[PDB]
Amino acid sequence: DLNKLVKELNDLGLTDVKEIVYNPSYEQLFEEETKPGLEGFDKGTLTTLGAVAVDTGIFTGRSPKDKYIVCDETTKDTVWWNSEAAKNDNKPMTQETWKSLRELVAKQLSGKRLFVVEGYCGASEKHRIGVRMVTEVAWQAHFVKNMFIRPTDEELKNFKADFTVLNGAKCTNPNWKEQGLNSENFVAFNITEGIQLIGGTWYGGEMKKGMFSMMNYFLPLKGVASMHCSANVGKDGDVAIFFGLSGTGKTTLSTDPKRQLIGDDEHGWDESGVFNFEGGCYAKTINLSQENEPDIYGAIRRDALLENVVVRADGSVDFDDGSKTENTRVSYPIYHIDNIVRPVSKAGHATKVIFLTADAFGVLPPVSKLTPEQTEYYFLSGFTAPTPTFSACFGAAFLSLHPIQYADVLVERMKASGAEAYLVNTGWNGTGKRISIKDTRGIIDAILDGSIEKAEMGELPIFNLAIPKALPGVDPAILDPRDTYADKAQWQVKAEDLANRFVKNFVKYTANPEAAKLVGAGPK
Numbered sequence: 352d353l354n355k356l357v358k359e360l361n362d363l364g365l366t367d368v369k370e371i372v373y374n375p376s377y378e379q380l381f382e383e384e385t386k387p388g389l390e391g392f393d394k395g396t397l398t399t400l401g402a403v404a405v406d407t408g409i410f411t412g413r414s415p416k417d418k419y420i421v422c423d424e425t426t427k428d429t430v431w432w433n434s435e436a437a438k439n440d441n442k443p444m445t446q447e448t449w450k451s452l453r454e455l456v457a458k459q460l461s462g463k464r465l466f467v468v469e470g471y472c473g474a475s476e477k478h479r480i481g482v483r484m485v486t487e488v489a490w491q492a493h494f495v496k497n498m499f500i501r502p503t504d505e506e507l508k509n510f511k512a513d514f515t516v517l518n519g520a521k522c523t524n525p526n527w528k529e530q531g532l533n534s535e536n537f538v539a540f541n542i543t544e545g546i547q548l549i550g551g552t553w554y555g556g557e558m559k560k561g562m563f564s565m566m567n568y569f570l571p572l573k574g575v576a577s578m579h580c581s582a583n584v585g586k587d588g589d590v591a592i593f594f595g596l597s598g599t600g601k602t603t604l605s606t607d608p609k610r611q612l613i614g615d616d617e618h619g620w621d622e623s624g625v626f627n628f629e630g631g632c633y634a635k636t637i638n639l640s641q642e643n644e645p646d647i648y649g650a651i652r653r654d655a656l657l658e659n660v661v662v663r664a665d666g667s668v669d670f671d672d673g674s675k676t677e678n679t680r681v682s683y684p685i686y687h688i689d690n691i692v693r694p695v696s697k698a699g700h701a702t703k704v705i706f707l708t709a710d711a712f713g714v715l716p717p718v719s720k721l722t723p724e725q726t727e728y729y730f731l732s733g734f735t736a737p738t739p740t741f742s743a744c745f746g747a748a749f750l751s752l753h754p755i756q757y758a759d760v761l762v763e764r765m766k767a768s769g770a771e772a773y774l775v776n777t778g779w780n781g782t783g784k785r786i787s788i789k790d791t792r793g794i795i796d797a798i799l800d801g802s803i804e805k806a807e808m809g810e811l812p813i814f815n816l817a818i819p820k821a822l823p824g825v826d827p828a829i830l831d832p833r834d835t836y837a838d839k840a841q842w843q844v845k846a847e848d849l850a851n852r853f854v855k856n857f858v859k860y861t862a863n864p865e866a867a868k869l870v871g872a873g874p875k
């Protein structure tokens with residue numbers, strides 16, 4: 352089977368291929384990462400935790416300015432290209448420049464020992480993409496073994512590489528200026544050929560988010576939702592999905608001993624149900640505490656891969672040290688976490704969709720039940736905060752299609768399963784402080800158990816949001832945010848301000864005529 356592999360690599364441009372370490376075991380990868388003689392960023396370091404640690408150099412996070420998608424007959428009219436109307440990272444690359452870069456990476460990966468790992472992006476039998484990653488660095492192969500779904504031996508016998516990632520991190524492009532690119536580095540995608548090239552950056556995330564961006568292209572075009580969310584399932588099979596930017600409490604509210612975790616970051620929703628795209632977790636570790644983060648900490652053992660953490664002379668890890676970067680990370684296969692769905696990360700249809708937001712303006716209700724149109728409007732807005740952040744579809748950096756396409760397919764799936772969407776503000780109110788964890792958990796409990804659907808509803812002005820008048824165990828005095836203000840004028844002025852920010856933010860999305868129709872569902 353290696354012969355067929357070498358041939359396929361040869362067809363991509365790689366020549367003089369030496370030994371290929373094909374789908375190595377975790378034990379083999381561990382030894383490869385720590386063998387004597389490794390130089391540069393290839394080198395893994397042994398830690399007191401039994402987990403290997405590596406560094407990534409210059410790039411310790413994604414490089415959106417270096418992201419490109421090839422402009423061709425397939426993508427011309429389908430990709431949500433960057434434009435003056437709405438700036439984004441989908442920058443067009445000519446076929447000529449792509450050819451030059453593919454040849455450059457193929458040359459970088461020629462004449463040497465290679466690691467090749469095959470895995471699936473998507474737990475769905477019908478919508479998964481078979482990913483093959485080729486690298487000259489063992490730990491990069493380990494990252495892919497962790498983050499994508501690990502095929503069974505039977506599945507590998509019939510494995511089809513729908514997308515190939517050629518990782519040429521050691522390679523940089525000195526022709527960039529003349530080619531009109533951003534820098535000597537590049538993270539490029541050719542949708543027609545099914546290839547992602549990585550040059551110059553060693554950040555692990557480029558591999559994970561590259562395929563996420565590709566799932567975000569292929570799935571919605573086939574009517575399958577592609578989402579940046581977490582998802583869990585209850586004892587009775589009830590599925591809920593949670594959306595929310597950093598600081599909204601997504602991780603905590605998605606954690607429940609009574610519910611199994613489907614996934615924490617990337618999911619699809621097809622005719623059968625909700626499925627994780629990934630086979631592992633890529634978690635932030637800065638200031639990580641065993642007491643504060645027991646689950647993540649316990650997963651950091653052999654087979655986890657630490658990235659950019661400070662490792663002392665004795666092998667101990669100083670998780671509080673952000674000297675290399677504040678974005679320290681660790682990746683690990685999902686089974687390093689206990690309360691998860693097994694042996695495949697998927698379940699049935701979602702019936703509860705929760706949009707979390709931390710409103711620093713103290714205007715939005717702790718919980719609102721949205722209409723279908725509002726669900727699309729607030730999904731496109733992706734608001735959280737007072738300094739506001741608006742990230743379309745809670746994942747602007749990975750949107751290969753227009754935000755409205757993700758919103759439309761999400762609502763179509765919701766309509767088919769009778770799902771309801773709720774906007775939950777885990778942020779502030781008239782008290783000047785954030786809502787209590789007791790009240791937010793009570794709110795999430797009422798959404799999951801359906802009691803919110805039995806509540807009498809009122810309506811908040813300006814945003815025209817349906818709000819419950821009472822929920823089991825939740826303080827009724829906070830449900831209408833106006834009630835937490837002694838002077839309802841403070842609310843009024845801040846609401847008009849926040850409303851204005853939503854309306855101004857939305858203009859750029861109106862460049863798409865379908866999204867333009869949603870203005871009426873937004874605040875007035």
Ligand SMILES: *SC[C@@H](O)[C@H](O)CS(=O)(=O)[O-]
Nearest residue numbers: 455458459521522523524
């Ligand atoms: S960036 C790729 C480039 O460094 C290339 O591998 C150099 S060569 O092997 O001398 O052609």
Ligand SMILES: [Mn+2]
Nearest residue numbers: 579616617746
């Ligand atoms: Mn993410």
